[PDB]
Design an enzyme around this catalytic site. Structure first.
Site: not given
Ligand SMILES: Nc1ncnc2c1ncn2[C@@H]1O[C@H](COP(=O)(O)OP(=O)(O)OP(=O)(O)O)[C@@H](O)[C@H]1O
Ligand SMILES: Nc1ncnc2c1ncn2[C@@H]1O[C@H](COP(=O)(O)OP(=O)(O)OP(=O)(O)O)[C@@H](O)[C@H]1O
Ligand SMILES: [Mg+2]
Ligand SMILES: [Mg+2]
Ligand SMILES: Nc1ncnc2c1ncn2[C@@H]1O[C@H](COP(=O)(O)OP(=O)(O)OP(=O)(O)O)[C@@H](O)[C@H]1O
Ligand SMILES: Nc1ncnc2c1ncn2[C@@H]1O[C@H](COP(=O)(O)OP(=O)(O)OP(=O)(O)O)[C@@H](O)[C@H]1O
Ligand SMILES: Nc1ncnc2c1ncn2[C@@H]1O[C@H](COP(=O)(O)OP(=O)(O)OP(=O)(O)O)[C@@H](O)[C@H]1O
Ligand SMILES: Nc1ncnc2c1ncn2[C@@H]1O[C@H](COP(=O)(O)OP(=O)(O)OP(=O)(O)O)[C@@H](O)[C@H]1O
Ligand SMILES: [Mg+2]
Ligand SMILES: [Mg+2]
Ligand SMILES: [Mg+2]
Ligand SMILES: [Mg+2]
Lengths: 485, 485, 485
Positions: A64, A213, A215, A305
């Site tokens: 293609e 097949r 593996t 956030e």
């Molecule tokens: N300078 C400050 N003095 C006093 N309090 C503060 C000051 N700055 C922030 N806070 C308080 O911290 C709070 C926000 O806490 P923080 O942003 O650490 O976590 P959070 O915002 O609760 O988490 P989330 O983002 O999930 O809301 C506010 O509600 C505020 O009252």
């Molecule tokens: N040693 C191994 N350990 C773990 N898994 C295995 C091992 N050998 C084969 N397998 C898994 O078992 C599956 C057996 O596939 P199988 O050939 O039975 O499919 P199928 O139905 O016969 O395929 P089709 O429909 O195309 O004929 C495989 O797809 C492979 O991932």
């Molecule tokens: Mg088969």
């Molecule tokens: Mg926060």
């Protein structure tokens, strides 16, 4: 003795984990999906990585596209396919229809195509082959019976040649048939599906391996993104519960809280601070990242956030100075709305910022902000990803989670992520004598002794000030206690 | 007198239980499913087991695959089909189309196929036959009327020969028609469906027997996995409520708790410990597995919330030593995320670890972790499976279940599994004079006297310390009691 | 004067109730359904019962099967069709296609078929005819216009002959068209549909009569099972509210409880015991079945939560001896998991065990166990079935129902079956001075005076010990009372 089939690594981040070692050697792989799912990128990235990582030449068969657009589009990802062609490592086989209305047969000479591919493989000693669109051929003969036969012939000949091939096909529906004809998934040995599912108003890209097949592999869908470096898959199920631990302590930024926690927080831990809006959660976060900077450690504050300018102002009102910490290259602030990116992208962004800045600590301004519009399962997986990564990288992590209610809470969080968290801090309102007071409690701490007191605290321009417990009151947790003496 | 039809055992774990003795002798069985459901594995495993277990030779008729890939893929499961071919026990009949664009008839010579199969059956004295893909033939003549006729002829001739045959067909939709043409399920006597259903982002493999003419079977779907040893089905409905019981007691690891339980826990019992995060559930688990080791008994700790390294650290902080218990090969720790495997796989993993290590006791670190993303019905079935197995094998089992709330709980668990549990231990927070205290209570114990007291306890570096009841308080269960004297 | 159309009884348990007397005489009946729904069994059982019950000869017309497999499959149900053929009562008309690829016409000689059927009917003086698969013919001429005509001819000729005919057809979807062509349901006079619906992971077999021209019937679906004796339908709507009553009393096994109930339980009643896990519900059940045995009456204990071995142990710990009661053939214990059978099968099992053992009393160990994975409507119907049957058979019934919560209960059960129950016993936890005490109350008793007291009781190795009411406390029902004196 359970002999495994040898595999060829794709080097597509996360893919080789899902596939348990890459694609089977000497076999075809079918990659299907709807338009815009990144099929072409997958098949290009496959050949590209093979050439630069393992020095394995390859062939891209084009139906293609044209060689010029394949190269031009590739450049956006940082790689130059023209260079690899000039060096004789990459070859593009042009099998396009040409911009003409003329026709001779009305079908397609599959035999000629195969011989041209074989020639290119031998000439360039190709180990890897990709096919742009197999179904671009079948459109001229669309019966399911002929599609099965002709595909079989192509796959069988490629096996005889020995090159590993990634074939591309197409779908109409995200959850419909694997491929247009209901045939290709029965002929091919290895089947991979790329999806771009629209849910609500957002799109999610996922990758699935339907079968390989002979593996084993990981099953189901795994999320991925397409970034500047190509496809990056995030197989959360591949993450192991093997993270390290230690008895190293770090200060919270608040001296009295360090005492309540038995000598500070554990370095290798996840700390969750919860409570209603206005309880001071962001005060603890600001002091947390400050403490890191005070000790000359790097920290990243991920804000959801509040804007940077607002964070600076509020910090100044609490006796802190964020701009100075930025000048010293200790504090980095990353501000974005939850809605600006997918949940998968937020996880990738956090990981990328960590890799570049190499923080000792990180903080998440609001998990409840990230949870907006997110199902409980999708959200929980995000939290597991971020916390798992932070533990893996030995990064101290402080997470904020806002309560939906300020009185009568029966729980600490409604996200059900308290089983992930190692240390939990609760901030609540307490109604005392007609006023809205605040209280702080260390709810749990897995690796240590912690205080049990629910202590009154005040917020001033010096930050938090933690005092005494409510000894003469009952029902403090409810937020509306009664005095008994 | 209700004469049964003689059956041939497949020796596919769990299949013979579902089918009530295997497949009817001298009849065909139709196995349908979508691509990747393991149809080929079922039909190979059928012939393979027959040859090694009963010394019954068989024939595999191949249409899409080649003998070389059938053998190569089989090797991953530990068995060697090439060896069985050389010995004259297994024969592969190659009926592939060949990688050619040539054609002579455009249809298919069914008569020639049948005669070749008959020849192979007589030559190798085959008792078992499998057909790779019946519908690979019908694609050349796709009318439902001709499919019915031609399938009838194949089935009827196989009955005359007398060999038991497992035919493979294919589907597009998981919950659509049994087979492509809506015919095969009416012609065949025995119908089995393999599914690989995508729900959310996970896949679940299930097996169902739609019908067996002339004989009974279990109905509905039963989960299965494909592992290194082939198909392993887990027919929970086949488990019987016939487990043994005894009056043998084992120590909990906590002396005061043993007294509360009337002389320790029953060996043959399921113990559930519930409570909010931070109430010490994992402390009891750690002491439980330690007690086993103290008496030189093996135990397995299945961890879901914490890594091994973290478990070791937290254990040391409580005066325990997990590394020493591992060195003596008494304690084994299995750490994984709930998301790393399906619920069906977690059950299989638990069973496999038990079979290899032969524990006296096991513990589940968190059932609520396993319940993440799991429906109430799917979760409950898991719990029944694990607890039923543990009772069957006479393994003392300690299970942990986290509450979603820490105050005002009306219930002990929201999983509704308390009807499975024999002994229940509750850990709760109690707010006393402004502090978050803890309390322990033995809620029930089916086979014994137990204490009724709700006792205050503390956690230190010596583990739990259980004291006195709250005699002078009311409403202890609510978590926010009032003092009366 | 509302003259009814004469009907022919099928003697298929429950069918003749649904159809209000069986199938109309001298008319065809169309039985449709998907593969595995038991269509063939219905049509065989119809002819079989006619021959043995009414001495009415019949003809089975075969298209897909052969006479040998019809007979062989039939044997599993205890009946011998070969015997009936030898005696000249049953005739099988072989209209199979034969295992050949040859053809002469490409259609079907319906006229020849009808004449052969007519001959067989006259020769054997058949009253009943069944047709294996009408649509096995139409496949050769699948236009809806020809299907209508040809079916009309077959039905019309059969009416002229006068034999009553049960025709079999087929469907693809459970809730799709009545038959493949959308024709047969408009041509036939009487239409019956057999379904095998997959919900969750379980299958439910149901029967419906869509219509009977000229006569009434019950409407909608009615559940059925296929057992060793053939099809058994359970038309709950056909059960009448006409059960007998009496003033006969039976002991509960607990003397003090008998006093609370005004002189023991009524023999002809349903008794429900409810409460949280660990309140002693199973203690009352054990004493209930013991009392029956003490008076030399038979009783059946249906166990769902506990195995037989565990029941024996727990009984011994309470001073009872279950093994002795079994040796005397007075006590029978039936243990199974709720998940081992469908809800329809559990009802059938209970009825079968009652019919064989002829108990004076039964007990259900846990209704809440049976309700697992069951919708409120499906569960309620089960309870109505079991309790209705027990009343009909004059069997004293004790049922156990576990509460999902142990404190603050607003209700006695969440199953909404308290309107079925005649006598209700409540067991609850009461928190007194820091301890988990128990209390017992007779909530209601329809036919008698009962005590109002909520009495404290203890459980020891002598069973329950019921004492005094909580006269000096308020809010006992809440479970967390307050002392007032
Ligand atoms: N300078 C400050 N003095 C006093 N309090 C503060 C000051 N700055 C922030 N806070 C308080 O911290 C709070 C926000 O806490 P923080 O942003 O650490 O976590 P959070 O915002 O609760 O988490 P989330 O983002 O999930 O809301 C506010 O509600 C505020 O009252
Ligand atoms: N040693 C191994 N350990 C773990 N898994 C295995 C091992 N050998 C084969 N397998 C898994 O078992 C599956 C057996 O596939 P199988 O050939 O039975 O499919 P199928 O139905 O016969 O395929 P089709 O429909 O195309 O004929 C495989 O797809 C492979 O991932
Ligand atoms: Mg088969
Ligand atoms: Mg926060
Ligand atoms: N540099 C980049 N950064 C981020 N995203 C990119 C970049 N380059 C491409 N993409 C995205 O990746 C996607 C890759 O599309 P791709 O060509 O793989 O789809 P396709 O399945 O091959 O299309 P078709 O099905 O029509 O052949 C594009 O839709 C584009 O939005
Ligand atoms: N060395 C110690 N000294 C005092 N208290 C401790 C010590 N170690 C742990 N704890 C206490 O134990 C609590 C954790 O208990 P544990 O880990 O046993 O179960 P849990 O974490 O509550 O269960 P979940 O994993 O569901 O939260 C912490 O809140 C902490 O206060
Ligand atoms: N002895 C038995 N005990 C219990 N169940 C049985 C017994 N014999 C048969 N069955 C069940 O009853 C069902 C009867 O199937 P039946 O042959 O009636 O289906 P059908 O509709 O005739 O099939 P088709 O639609 O393919 O013609 C079988 O699927 C089988 O599982
Ligand atoms: N020998 C005994 N002495 C004293 N108490 C006992 C004895 N045996 C059992 N119990 C008490 O009986 C309780 C269990 O009661 P029972 O098994 O009769 O019903 P249940 O188990 O509450 O019902 P469910 O099965 O719904 O939980 C236990 O909690 C235990 O304290
Ligand atoms: Mg493309
Ligand atoms: Mg824990
Ligand atoms: Mg039939
Ligand atoms: Mg019980």
């Amino acid at each position: 003795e359970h002999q495994a089939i040898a595999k060829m690594r794709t080097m597509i981040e996360g893919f080789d984990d899902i596939s348990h070692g890459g694609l089977p050697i000497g076999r075809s792989t079918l990659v299907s999906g709807t338009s815009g799912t990144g099929k072409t990128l997958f098949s290009i990235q496959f050949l590209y990585n093979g050439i630069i990582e393992f020095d394995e030449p390859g062939v891209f068969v084009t139906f293609e596209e044209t060689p010029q657009d394949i190269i031009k589009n590739a450049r956006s990802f940082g790689w130059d396919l023209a260079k690899l062609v000039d060096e004789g490592k990459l070859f593009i086989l042009d099998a396009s229809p040409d911009p003409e209305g003329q026709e001779v047969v009305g079908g397609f000479d599959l035999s000629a195509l195969i011989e041209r591919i074989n020639y290119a493989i031998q000439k360039y000693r190709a180990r890897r082959v990709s096919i742009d669109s197999v179904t671009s051929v079948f459109q001229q003969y669309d019966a399911s019976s002929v599609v099965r036969r002709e595909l079989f012939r192509l796959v069988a000949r490629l096996k005889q040649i020995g090159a590993t091939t990634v074939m591309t096909t197409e779908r109409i529906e995200e959850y419909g048939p694997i491929a247009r004809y209901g045939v290709e998934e029965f002929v091919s040995d290895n089947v991979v599906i790329l999806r771009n599912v629209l849910e609500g108003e957002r799109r999610r890209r996922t990758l699935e391996i339907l079968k390989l097949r002979g593996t084993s592999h990981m099953k189901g869908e795994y999320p991925f993104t397409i970034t500047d470096h190509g496809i990056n898959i995030f197989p959360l199920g591949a993450m192991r519960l093997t993270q390290r631990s230690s008895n190293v302590r770090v200060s919270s930024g608040v001296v009295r809280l360090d005492e309540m926690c038995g000598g500070g927080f554990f370095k290798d831990s996840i700390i969750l601070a919860t409570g209603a809006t206005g309880t001071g959660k962001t005060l603890l976060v600001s002091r947390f990242v400050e403490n890191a900077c005070a000790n000359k450690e790097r920290a990243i504050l991920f804000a959801y956030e509040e804007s940077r300018a607002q964070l600076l102002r509020n910090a100044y009102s609490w006796g802190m100075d964020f701009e100075e910490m930025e000048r010293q290259n200790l504090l980095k602030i990353v501000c974005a709305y939850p809605e600006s990116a997918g949940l998968e992208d937020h996880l990738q962004i956090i990981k990328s910022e960590i890799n570049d800045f190499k923080p000792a600590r990180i903080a998440i301004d609001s998990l409840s902000a990230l949870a907006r519009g997110v199902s409980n399962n999708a959200f929980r997986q995000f939290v597991i990803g971020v916390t798992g990564y932070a533990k893996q990288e030995e990064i101290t992590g402080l997470f904020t989670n806002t309560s939906d209610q300020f009185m009568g809470a029966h729980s600490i969080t409604d996200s059900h992520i308290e089983a992930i968290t190692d240390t939990i801090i609760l901030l609540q309102y307490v109604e005392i004598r007609g006023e809205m007071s605040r209280a702080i409690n260390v709810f749990k701490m897995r690796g240590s002794w912690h205080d049990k007191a629910i202590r009154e605290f005040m917020i001033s321009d010096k930050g938090p000030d933690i005092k005494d417990s409510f000894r003469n009151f009952e029902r403090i947790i409810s937020g509306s206690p009664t005095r008994i003496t």
